[PDB]
Design a protein around this ligand. Sequence first.
Ligand code: BCL
Ligand code: BCL
Ligand SMILES: CC[C@H]1c2cc3[nH]c4c(c3C)C(=O)[C@H](C(=O)OC)c4c3nc(cc4[nH]c(cc(n2)[C@@H]1C)c(C(C)=O)c4C)[C@@H](C)[C@@H]3CCC(=O)OC/C=C(\C)CCC[C@H](C)CCC[C@H](C)CCCC(C)C
Ligand SMILES: COC(C)(C)C/C=C/C(C)=C/C=C/C(C)=C/C=C/C(C)=C/C=C/C=C(C)/C=C/C=C(\C)CC/C=C(\C)CCC=C(C)C
Ligand SMILES: COC(C)(C)C/C=C/C(C)=C/C=C/C(C)=C/C=C/C(C)=C/C=C/C=C(C)/C=C/C=C(\C)CC/C=C(\C)CCC=C(C)C
Ligand SMILES: COC(C)(C)C/C=C/C(C)=C/C=C/C(C)=C/C=C/C(C)=C/C=C/C=C(C)/C=C/C=C(\C)CC/C=C(\C)CCC=C(C)C
Ligand SMILES: COC(C)(C)C/C=C/C(C)=C/C=C/C(C)=C/C=C/C(C)=C/C=C/C=C(C)/C=C/C=C(\C)CC/C=C(\C)CCC=C(C)C
Ligand SMILES: COC(C)(C)C/C=C/C(C)=C/C=C/C(C)=C/C=C/C(C)=C/C=C\C=C(C)\C=C\C=C(/C)CC/C=C(\C)CCC=C(C)C
Ligand SMILES: CCCCCCCCCCCCO[C@@H]1O[C@H](CO)[C@@H](O[C@H]2O[C@H](CO)[C@@H](O)[C@H](O)[C@H]2O)[C@H](O)[C@H]1O
Ligand SMILES: CCCCCCCCCCCCO[C@@H]1O[C@H](CO)[C@@H](O[C@H]2O[C@H](CO)[C@@H](O)[C@H](O)[C@H]2O)[C@H](O)[C@H]1O
Ligand SMILES: [Fe+3]
Lengths: 50, 281, 38, 42, 43, 42, 43, 43, 43, 306, 53, 51, 54, 54, 54, 54
Amino acid sequence: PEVSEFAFRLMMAAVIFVGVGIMFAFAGGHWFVGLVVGGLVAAFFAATPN
Amino acid sequence: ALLSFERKYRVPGGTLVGGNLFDFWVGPFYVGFFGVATFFFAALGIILIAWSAVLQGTWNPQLISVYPPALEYGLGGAPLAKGGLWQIITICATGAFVSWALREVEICRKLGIGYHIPFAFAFAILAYLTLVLFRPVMMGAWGYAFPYGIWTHLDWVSNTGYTYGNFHYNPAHMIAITFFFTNALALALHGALVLSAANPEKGKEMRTPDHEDTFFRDLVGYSIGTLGIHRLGLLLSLSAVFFSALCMIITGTIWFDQWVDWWQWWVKLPWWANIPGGING
Amino acid sequence: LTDEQAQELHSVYMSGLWLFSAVAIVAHLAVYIWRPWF
Amino acid sequence: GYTGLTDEQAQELHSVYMSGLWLFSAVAIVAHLAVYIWRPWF
Amino acid sequence: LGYTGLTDEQAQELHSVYMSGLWLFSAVAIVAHLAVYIWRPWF
Amino acid sequence: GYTGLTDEQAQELHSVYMSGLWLFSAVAIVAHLAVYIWRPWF
Amino acid sequence: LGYTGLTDEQAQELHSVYMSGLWLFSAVAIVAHLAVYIWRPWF
Amino acid sequence: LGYTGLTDEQAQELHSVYMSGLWLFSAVAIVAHLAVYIWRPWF
Amino acid sequence: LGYTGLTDEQAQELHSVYMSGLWLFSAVAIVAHLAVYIWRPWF
Amino acid sequence: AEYQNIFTQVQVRGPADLGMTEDVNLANRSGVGPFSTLLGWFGNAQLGPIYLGSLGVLSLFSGLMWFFTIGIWFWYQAGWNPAVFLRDLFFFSLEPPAPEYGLSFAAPLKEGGLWLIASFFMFVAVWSWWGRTYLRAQALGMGKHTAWAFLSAIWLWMVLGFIRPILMGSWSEAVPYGIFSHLDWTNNFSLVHGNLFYNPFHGLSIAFLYGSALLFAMHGATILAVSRFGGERELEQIADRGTAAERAALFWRWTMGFNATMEGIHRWAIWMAVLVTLTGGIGILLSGTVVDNWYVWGQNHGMAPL
Amino acid sequence: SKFYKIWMIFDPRRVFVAQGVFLFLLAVMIHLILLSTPSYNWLEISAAKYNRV
Amino acid sequence: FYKIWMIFDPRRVFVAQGVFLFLLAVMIHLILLSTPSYNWLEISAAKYNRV
Amino acid sequence: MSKFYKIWMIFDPRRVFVAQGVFLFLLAVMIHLILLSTPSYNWLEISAAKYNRV
Amino acid sequence: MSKFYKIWMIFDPRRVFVAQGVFLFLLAVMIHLILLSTPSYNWLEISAAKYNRV
Amino acid sequence: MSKFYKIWMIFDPRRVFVAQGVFLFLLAVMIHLILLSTPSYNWLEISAAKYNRV
Amino acid sequence: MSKFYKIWMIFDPRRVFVAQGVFLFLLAVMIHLILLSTPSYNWLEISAAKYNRV
Ligand code: BCL
Ligand code: BCL
Ligand SMILES: CC[C@H]1c2cc3[nH]c4c(c3C)C(=O)[C@H](C(=O)OC)c4c3nc(cc4[nH]c(cc(n2)[C@@H]1C)c(C(C)=O)c4C)[C@@H](C)[C@@H]3CCC(=O)OC/C=C(\C)CCC[C@H](C)CCC[C@H](C)CCCC(C)C
Ligand SMILES: COC(C)(C)C/C=C/C(C)=C/C=C/C(C)=C/C=C/C(C)=C/C=C/C=C(C)/C=C/C=C(\C)CC/C=C(\C)CCC=C(C)C
Ligand SMILES: COC(C)(C)C/C=C/C(C)=C/C=C/C(C)=C/C=C/C(C)=C/C=C/C=C(C)/C=C/C=C(\C)CC/C=C(\C)CCC=C(C)C
Ligand SMILES: COC(C)(C)C/C=C/C(C)=C/C=C/C(C)=C/C=C/C(C)=C/C=C/C=C(C)/C=C/C=C(\C)CC/C=C(\C)CCC=C(C)C
Ligand SMILES: COC(C)(C)C/C=C/C(C)=C/C=C/C(C)=C/C=C/C(C)=C/C=C/C=C(C)/C=C/C=C(\C)CC/C=C(\C)CCC=C(C)C
Ligand SMILES: COC(C)(C)C/C=C/C(C)=C/C=C/C(C)=C/C=C/C(C)=C/C=C\C=C(C)\C=C\C=C(/C)CC/C=C(\C)CCC=C(C)C
Ligand SMILES: CCCCCCCCCCCCO[C@@H]1O[C@H](CO)[C@@H](O[C@H]2O[C@H](CO)[C@@H](O)[C@H](O)[C@H]2O)[C@H](O)[C@H]1O
Ligand SMILES: CCCCCCCCCCCCO[C@@H]1O[C@H](CO)[C@@H](O[C@H]2O[C@H](CO)[C@@H](O)[C@H](O)[C@H]2O)[C@H](O)[C@H]1O
Ligand SMILES: [Fe+3]
């Protein structure tokens, strides 16, 4: 599909940041818990491609 | 009237529209297809501003203002004396800016260089289109755009800012202001560092980019490099404008109250909202 | 991607899909007993 | 092997990986039984 | 298998020392939980 | 061998490192005992 | 070892003098704390 | 050792001058504190 | 022999000129304070 | 896709560059620190070495005391609660003494006394760093443009905190040490002097802050555009003009009708940035001392209807 | 079976690291959700049973 | 269906398929909590008189 | 089961040990903070109420 | 258990000694600040009440 | 304990003394400023109350 | 307690004298500024009250 691995990781991290952000905002009792947990994981996900 | 090295660069080609119909230079300026468009839009908008002055009854340039149509007209047309002239000048300005950006693309192709300059100018255009077109369209009327006066477009900024209290508390404003201050600081450092290398102390040999790295490592312990500083300068300004347009496309469309109250989401986080002491507890 | 290599991957993938879907069939079946939504 | 693992290495690796997988699942099952004994959630 | 430069003997003695530390840490954890449970039981 | 020490060098170093560690904990225990007499937290 | 280049004999000379200053520093601290506790005790 | 190259003759001669100024500075400070204490004590 | 490439006799002369200017600056300051104190004491 | 030269696609690393010793006291210069792969995607990867001499000690220790004094006041203002300190970090402030004291130094440590102590540490730290900025250039036999450009920013810094409060006769005119605190000071400074927008030098100062942003976007985009012709090494373009400098000049010649050289564009850059704080210092120094209402003054000077 | 072929495409180091972060977050979320529901907040439940609060 | 693992990278499909499946699962689960009729915790809490 | 030692071949000990200790310290701080927040288990307040100090 | 010296064949002693010293002092000051904030252990304010200095 | 002299064989004496000197002064300045803030130990104000200077 | 002269065999004399000179200057001004801040020790205001000045 001619998509770079860095670019594909950015697409997949963006889903994860939005996704995991929703689940931990629910569990955390505040949307900021979802932001930190969702953001930190995506920052770790997008920074380690193949 | 050519630079001593300009003869070998004036070749036919790299024109998006035409090819020889508008492929020539008037003096040093390149008259493309969009140079004809830029001149017409630049000239018409200027004379309309001159005409709007006689309708206003003033000749002091610092008092001339073209006001947008009043809030009662919504998002439609307006009489020329009221706000119709603003809509023509806004169209003329929008046409002149896009033609100027498009004309720069033809110059890049004829010289065979990258398109970084026209891309960076489109960021300015998008910030301008945010204030006059995108944001007023969302809010619902043309009367939220700024007027075309030297000191009255400052009154629009002041009045819009104080609608939401102190505008310093807009979080995207703070990010944008940080980029603007960093860009000017880096510009002073970049100009001074290159000038000091090219103009050494006195009777000394011109320095080298190895002296440029060494100076900033001695000073602040790091040196971004000669390629890094130019990438940074471009990105600081594009970021400064991006967060500039971001802070105004969210003001009055998503956020409606004082910007000071936004920061109470942090101070009222459940795990420390009730701890006594400090400023807010 | 060798066809023999690609044949193995598709077969093993479908093997996983059936196993996962089979347990979900029981899981949906259990919830219908515990609480029928239709 | 496009990742560097041989076939015989893969079988040994998956044998250990499932050994941890079942061991971890086994401790979880015991925990759920204790919680169900404590106060059932059904 | 590789991937780090360790050997069968190097990984086994690395696990033996590491796992012994894991039990030592859990030895303190059980005692601490037991004292807390005597003091203020949560069950 | 990542740090470039020998086997006996680690034995010698760790012996001192524990010697300081038990010295630190001995003061900490005395510090915690002194406070508990003054004002218990349990 | 020997990251700093000091020999074993040189390290002993450095540490011996370092402790001498340390004990001198604390002795002033002990007298200072004793003076304050007699003046305005905190316990 | 040998971080600066100053010999023992240089180190003794450097320390003797420096410690001479330390007591000269400390004596002036002691007199100043004594003078201020007579004028206006803080304890 | 030094850190600054200055011979001992060169240092002897330079310090003598310096202390001469320091006594001059200090003596004029003492007159200034003595005159100000008599005019309007701060004690 | 097409490479835009914004990130280095390949990084090459070798021996650590220890710099050149023109007249530098090589003792004071430290050893080379780590290499950052993340910073290498954008610029150089090497951190250090840094020169810490005599003015480095004075500036770093004074800057430490200024920073640490404000921090302890914030811990006091938080009641020594780590959570409250974290919560109200952007709301804490160290404020100058009340206007009743004027310029006198007899204000209690909780009523503008620590502000004077912290301000002295900042005065020593900033000015010593200007000396270090000057002396670091001298040891390499380079021009003093960095020192004199920094002096323009120090000018606005001295007008805000030292010069104008002396001319107004009270330290209460100066800037409090806080995040949201000095934003309120900025907002209230305009309201007290009647819409600072109508200060001609605030207007000029903004013209060069936008001009700096305009100029660095232009210059940074121009160099990355002609970087394919070896245009990033501007120093060697000055010595021997190449096709990068000719295409860069001819772009703006055909666009604007006038251009610059490879060296002359950095005179525009340094002069555009220094006027941001050079003009701002005058406009701030004129506010209250000469004009106490910029909208009324504007009305008498065109700029506004009667 | 034939499930062991998965290690011949996916690098084992990233799979084990990715699985670890996934497992911990999934566990905390269930623990956090239980604490949010007053019916299963075991800390406060013990408070009422033992006459603590 | 055979060439799905050729047209797309086998690494990319498994990450894309697996991550979406997990997110779709937790969302569908979270909706059941969000509705007051399938919160199995609250249903049992009312059934066992523990709330 | 006895084959778990081979993870040290796959995983570098240095990065694992640093990442593990950071995980455990945050976990200990996180659990201690939760107990401090719950008034039933906040041991500092329990002592104050029990010994009549505030 | 009596084989923990082998950690020093993995970790550089200089980075551990620096990291540990930073960690312990940061941990110790944090606990002292928790006790100053809690008014039932503020030994500065406890002593004021006991000797009625205010 | 008698073998503590080998710390210098690991750590640069020049770097340790700089880090320690900045550490102690900021620790000492912090502690004085805490006593100064607390009215029960502000020796400047305690003397003023005693000798009726305010 | 006598071999301290060896410290000049480890520490650069130029750096040590500069750091010590910087430290005393900053320390002296801070203490003098503290005394001015305290109204009980401001020697300028003390003389004003004593000698009946402004
Ligand atoms: C409601 C508020 C008012 C307003 C009130 C003020 C006030 C008050 C001031 C400004 C000032 C400025 N305003 Mg205004 N301003 C308003 C509206 C605007 C608008 C807008 C779109 O509406 C814009 C773009 C601006 C922009 C500007 C700038 C042109 C100018 C700041 C220059 C600068 O960079 O100083 C920042 C740079 C410095 C202060 C120099 C700092 C250098 C020092 C020496 C470095 C110290 C470092 C420190 C120790 C930290 C060290 C850290 C470690 C080293 C890491 N204002 C409105 C109308 N504005 C300033 C000015 O001078 O204008 C006349 C100013 O004082
Ligand atoms: C009242 C309703 C019932 C209930 C009704 C149902 C129903 C109906 C269903 C479930 C299903 C599930 N339930 Mg239930 N369930 C309830 C309460 C719970 C609670 C709880 C805390 O109370 C938990 C933890 C669960 C958990 C589960 C899971 C075991 C299962 C979902 C699996 C899944 O998401 O696969 C998707 C996740 C993955 C595939 C993870 C892998 C993705 C990774 C991160 C990305 C790939 C990377 C990797 C390297 C690629 C290689 C391997 C790839 C996987 C190919 N349920 C309540 C009590 N539950 C579903 C099921 O049965 O599944 C079979 C289902 O249909
Ligand atoms: C996005 C990053 C920054 C940036 C970048 C940037 N600007 C650029 C470029 C780039 C890369 C160019 O290539 C282009 C150029 O060629 O510069 C010399 C340009 C340019 N940026 C310019 C100005 C400019 N840029 C600004 C800002 C910025 N430019 C950003 C901060 C500002 C601000 C902040 O106010 C201004 C005034 C021009 C010098 C030039 C574009 C010239 C142009 O458009 O030419 C054709 C049009 C005319 C000749 C004039 C038309 C006039 C109208 C018909 C009537 C008047 C309308 C106007 C809205 C009235 C305003 C009234 C009051 C508000 C005063
Ligand atoms: C609100 O509703 C909620 C969200 C609560 C409900 C939703 C629930 C959901 C979506 C649940 C989903 C659950 C899933 C998908 C769980 C999956 C769990 C899995 C796959 C667990 C697997 C664990 C595997 C383990 C623990 C393996 C361990 C292996 C070891 C310890 C051995 C170590 C050896 C290694 C790593 C390599 C060996 C090396 C060589 C060379 C052999
Ligand atoms: C919000 O949710 C709450 C908090 C309410 C509840 C949720 C709780 C959760 C999700 C908890 C999760 C807990 C987990 C996953 C805990 C795991 C803990 C483990 C596995 C801890 C392991 C510790 C291991 C240790 C301490 C091992 C130490 C080893 C040593 C000290 C030995 C040193 C190593 C050496 C010497 C290496 C040997 C070297 C050679 C060369 C042989
Ligand atoms: C907010 O919470 C508060 C602050 C209230 C409570 C928290 C308190 C805490 C955490 C306090 C922490 C205190 C600590 C860890 C203090 C440690 C103090 C130490 C280690 C002091 C050591 C001092 C040693 C000194 C001053 C030694 C000086 C020695 C010399 C100056 C001699 C110079 C060395 C020479 C001459 C060696 C010559 C030999 C050769 C070969 C050159
Ligand atoms: C918010 O949550 C609260 C604070 C309320 C509760 C949370 C509490 C938590 C998370 C507490 C955590 C506690 C921990 C992890 C404590 C750890 C304590 C440790 C690891 C102490 C270790 C001490 C080690 C020491 C003091 C080492 C001394 C070492 C020496 C003196 C070095 C000797 C070496 C020499 C002299 C050279 C060696 C080299 C050769 C060649 C011999
Ligand atoms: C946990 O955190 C610790 C405690 C470790 C450290 C934390 C520190 C923190 C939180 C620091 C926060 C710092 C902040 C927020 C700093 C903000 C500074 C700002 C916004 C400054 C803005 C403007 C300041 C200006 C313009 C200052 C100007 C000062 C002068 C121009 C010189 C002043 C000198 C004067 C007034 C006279 C002094 C002379 C005598 C004789 C006293
Ligand atoms: C991208 C990262 C950030 C994503 C954030 C997106 C928006 C939030 C997504 C989740 C929406 C629901 O999130 C939920 O909303 C309720 C609304 O009161 C809040 O929850 C709060 O009230 C609910 C009941 O109403 C309680 O169960 C909970 O204990 C309390 O904290 C929190 O916000 C969160 O529990
Ligand atoms: C590029 C940025 C600037 C763009 C400027 C565009 C301006 C030109 C607008 C063209 C479209 C005008 O759109 C048209 O405006 C007229 C203005 O009277 C509106 O006219 C409306 O108001 C008039 C007022 O007497 C009434 O008859 C009636 O309420 C309605 O017809 C129409 O509802 C609308 O369809
Ligand atoms: Fe440049």
